[PDB]
RNA sequence: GACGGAGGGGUACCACCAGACGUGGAGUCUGCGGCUCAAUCUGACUCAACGCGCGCACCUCACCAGGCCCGGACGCGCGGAGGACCGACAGCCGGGCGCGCUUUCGCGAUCGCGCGGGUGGUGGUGCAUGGCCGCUCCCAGCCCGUGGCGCGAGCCGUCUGCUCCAUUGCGACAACGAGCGAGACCCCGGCCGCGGGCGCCGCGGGACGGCCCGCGGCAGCGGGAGGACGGCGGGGCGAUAGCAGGUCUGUGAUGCCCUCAGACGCCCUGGGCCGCACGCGCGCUACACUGGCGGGGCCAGCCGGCGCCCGCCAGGACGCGCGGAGCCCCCGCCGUGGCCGGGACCGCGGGCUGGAACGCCCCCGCGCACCAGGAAUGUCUUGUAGGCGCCCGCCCCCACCGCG
């Protein structure tokens, strides 16, 4: 699907920031959460289950994460080289900082 | 000083959730705790085929996870309480948690 | 659309919270686990043989 | 329903001096025993008449045999709960049998009664060991397996 | 008289099902560490993670910000407490004594070609060396044959059934993926002078008076 | 005491006889055609039942006294089992429009006083059902 | 080593004595074979397949009869902003789907196109496997260090003597010391302290073949007791060496081949697994007077809540903090009759869970065989068998099934 530039930025802006995702199953419960992206005149919404797993997959083939799959669940970790992806995304500077 | 507290206290090992009873007690000779209520032990009881395969006779694996609840009620002022369960010793996967 | 009949609710879906298989759930308690998968973490629980 | 968290609170002190327990497969007796007219109530119902027929007669054995006179002098208020009607009729009269020798006080004469009692009916003052066993996933009963198809 | 509703053990049952993912998890991410035991301090929602490993160092003490990744992805995931749910990593001492970080060193040395035989051997001296009473490797499988075959190898005395065995021997398996398939290492260590319990059969005397 | 001096089987056949001769309770009529509940295959001959019936109901109601009863409870208190069919007997309550019924006269004729949840036996009930008793024997 | 219709010890209601309670015979219920099929997904075949792989309206779900779309990632060359990608009113065609079409209206770089390569697949093979688990085995055996014996395979310790429930002990012995298994242990009892009580729940004792009488190198045993408790209350764990036992259809278990965009991906619909000329396995209910049937009392444990009214029930609405079997006992009716034994299909009817019966429930009909099961075999020793109900599992609804 065309994935929501909002979308994407909140699972980026979520990764920077705590320097951690995860996802469930495709059945959805209220969508993702940990995700809230705005439309302009959308409520605080969710990104359907399906978009955040396309693109984090697309996002561990380019090497932005590193995943471990426990209780089918996903446990991705950010990998330095995704800082410079997400910050680049975010057009943030190298003195930002994530949670740690 | 009077305001009446309610805790609870549960733990898979008879012995761990012994522990902190016998804490409890100890600083609660500052505070008046009452006596240790034991409840009837909850059990969590499954009882399993252990093959995975039907091969063999039907063959069962009795698996069980009883928890152990102390009920402890004090009339005290919530510093006081916060400042037994602060004291008294604590040991890892033992719960205690406190209704007003 | 495809978008407009995927996964259409027809039934719960329930599967071992550790291996994700419908068949033998478990609902007795709040353990949602597979009957051969729980067998292998029964030990990290801490269920017991008597 | 058996061995409930207050043994007798219907009716508490009030005289009840003596108190007696009798044990029958998941019968507990409760006894509360005081020194009164001589007439008993077991579950607030006169012991000389319960719903039984044949388990009436049962009922009344240790009160004759340890002297009826002695008995008389005491009023008990034993509550049996849980077991069965066979059970209970059993533990009341364990109960009943120790009920009257705690009050009479330790002395020769109580002691010649009680071998004159246990003698006659065995396992009066001795609650009954036996216990319902355990159901293995062999069958349907403890010891009871599945018919074997192929031998 | 009381309610039976009692949602106190439903909550430590949610507590015990998230240890056992938590458990999960650790084992394959931290291959580095030799992660062994998880808890949760939970203690009025701060939920502390007591984690016992051998090594830290890899996962910790890189500014110490991959500690901190973890944390944020078990609240993440648990989507629980943020900064209650810190993680107290450790470092265990005997590592031959343990079981977990002798089989997670064998699966690793048979993966780069170490000899079977040396390799179990390695793993048997360090509970030798350690002092502990009784190691075995049962590594079973494809093992240089179109059939399965199975290669105990062994050193010193180890007890093998009775209530004991729960409380004074070491199981851990692994399975390792060679090029053949899978294959299933196996570690057991029995040490009567563990902590505060005394195997039950041996009586002790020691003194005339 | 006293209701449990008087054998209850005999102070229960008795208190039909005392409520056909006093009026009390009355019997619906409607009566005839049902049966006492789903487990019952043939259905009540005795033609006294609801009389019959009746004067046990007030009898348990003074049996409990404070305790309080309700009527699907006073329905598990008849339970028999439920025959006829391959599957193995099962116990059945009986159902619950006949019992209804019954509680709802004693609470006319003062017999009945609604407590927390279920009803409880009222003061003037609780003498008359053990003044009879005591007077039968 | 395996075996003997060879001998000597033993031993076990998975063996027989002495009995019990049975099946097989009848309806039914579930599984299997056969078959019918569009599809009847299968796996499993003595013990150690066959209510087994935890309850099939859909889902599950692997199967069919039709369809939907990518969930071909990430990378190299090539094309692409008036558009790469990418939906849509009405009408049509079609359960249905802008599914397609006629049609004219958008999208907005989130891409196309080939390739390098993914990715999934309840597809196969448990005769490529891990893991688990069955089974030998409810077995008591299994091995070691050094030394002895033989050229070695191999022996000795590991006993052709005695006791155990037991390689359980003892007194021996070219063996002498060690282990592992059995014990021990641990959970749950039944009795006795103390501590605790929002719930009769937390730690200790007691019981040891100790004592007696024997018979005994011994090991013990055979009685007698005393003592809640007796010599193995009941279970959990269960050696070693294996098995071409079973599961790839539990498993970011997994070799390798196949499938991969008209997919063995994934959804959506309807049916399938429950179709029956059949043979069989596990159960249930019967075959009545030791019984049914109408009332009256009323006794439970695992561990668990209810009030009010409406209705023949079934069920539902309303409300809220809590509750409980059968058997049995007492009185009646039937009066040996397939009867008032027994309840099988079917004719309606009223209801529930339900998107939905093709599920269940109740009532009013109906009134199936079976009047005690041939040859054969199974289970079983004190709170035991059996009789008799209740709980819980899978559960949308449902059990005759299993765990209890």
Redesign the pocket.
Known sequence: ?????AV?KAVYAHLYENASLALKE?WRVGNVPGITYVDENGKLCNPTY?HV???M???????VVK????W?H?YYLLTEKGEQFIRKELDLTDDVLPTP | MHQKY?I?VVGKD??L??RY?KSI?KEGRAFGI??????????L??????????????????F?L?M????F?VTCGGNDISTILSKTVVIPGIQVTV?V | ??????????????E?R????????????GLFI????????AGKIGF??? | ???????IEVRERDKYTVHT?G??????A?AFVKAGKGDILV?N?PLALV?????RTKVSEPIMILGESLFKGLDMNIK?????????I?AVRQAISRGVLASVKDEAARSELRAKLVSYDR?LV?????????????????????????? | ??????VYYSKYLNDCIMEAELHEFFS?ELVDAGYASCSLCRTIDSICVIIQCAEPEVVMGDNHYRLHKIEYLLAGRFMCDPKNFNIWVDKIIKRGLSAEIMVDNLRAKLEEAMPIRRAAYSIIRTAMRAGAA?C?V?????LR??????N?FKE????????????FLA?A?????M????????VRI?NPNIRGAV????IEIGAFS | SSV?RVP??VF??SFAAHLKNRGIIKCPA?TD??????????????A??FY??????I??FY?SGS???????????????????????????????????I??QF?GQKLLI?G????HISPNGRKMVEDFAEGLQ
């Open positions: 699907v065309h994935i929501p530039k994407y495709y399906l797993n396309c693109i997959q697309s996002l561990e083939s380019r090497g995943d471990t799959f426990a089918r996903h | 309610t609870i008879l012995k959730v012994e009873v007690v009452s006596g240790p209520c034991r409840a009837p032990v909850r059990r009881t499954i009882t399993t085929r252990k093959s995975p395969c039907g091969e063999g006779t039907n063959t069962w694996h009795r069980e009883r152990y609840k102390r009920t009620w209704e | 659309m495809r978008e407009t009949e995927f996964c259409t609710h027809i039934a719960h879906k329930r071992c550790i291996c994700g298989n419908y068949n033998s759930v478990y609902r007795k308690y597979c009957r051969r998968c729980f067998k292998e973490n017991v043989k008597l | 329903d058996l061995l409930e968290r207050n043994d327990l044990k029958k497969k998941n019968s507990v409760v579950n119902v719903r039984p027929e044949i388990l049996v709960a849980g077991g069965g009607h066979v059970s209970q059993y396992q001795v609650s009954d060991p036996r216990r319902c066993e355990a159901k293995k996933f062999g069958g349907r009963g403890a010891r009871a397996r599945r018919q074997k198809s192929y031998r | 008289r009381r309610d039976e509703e009692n394959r009784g075995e049962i590594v079973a499988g494809k044959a179109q059939r399965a075959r199975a105990k010193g005395c180890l007890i093998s059934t009775g209530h004991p065995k729960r409380i199981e398996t692994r399975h390792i993926k090029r053949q398939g899978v294959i299933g290492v196996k029995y195997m039950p059969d041996k | 449990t209850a089987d229960i056949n409607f055609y049902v049966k006492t509940g789903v487990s019952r295959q043939y259905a009540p001959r005795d006294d039942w019959i019936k009746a004067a046990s109901v009898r348990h049996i305790h309080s009863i309700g009527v699907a409870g006073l329905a598990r208190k008849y339970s028999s089992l439920q025959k006829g069919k391959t599957t193995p007997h099962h116990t059945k309550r009986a159902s619950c429009k006949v019992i209804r019924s509680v709802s609470l609604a927390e949840r279920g009803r």
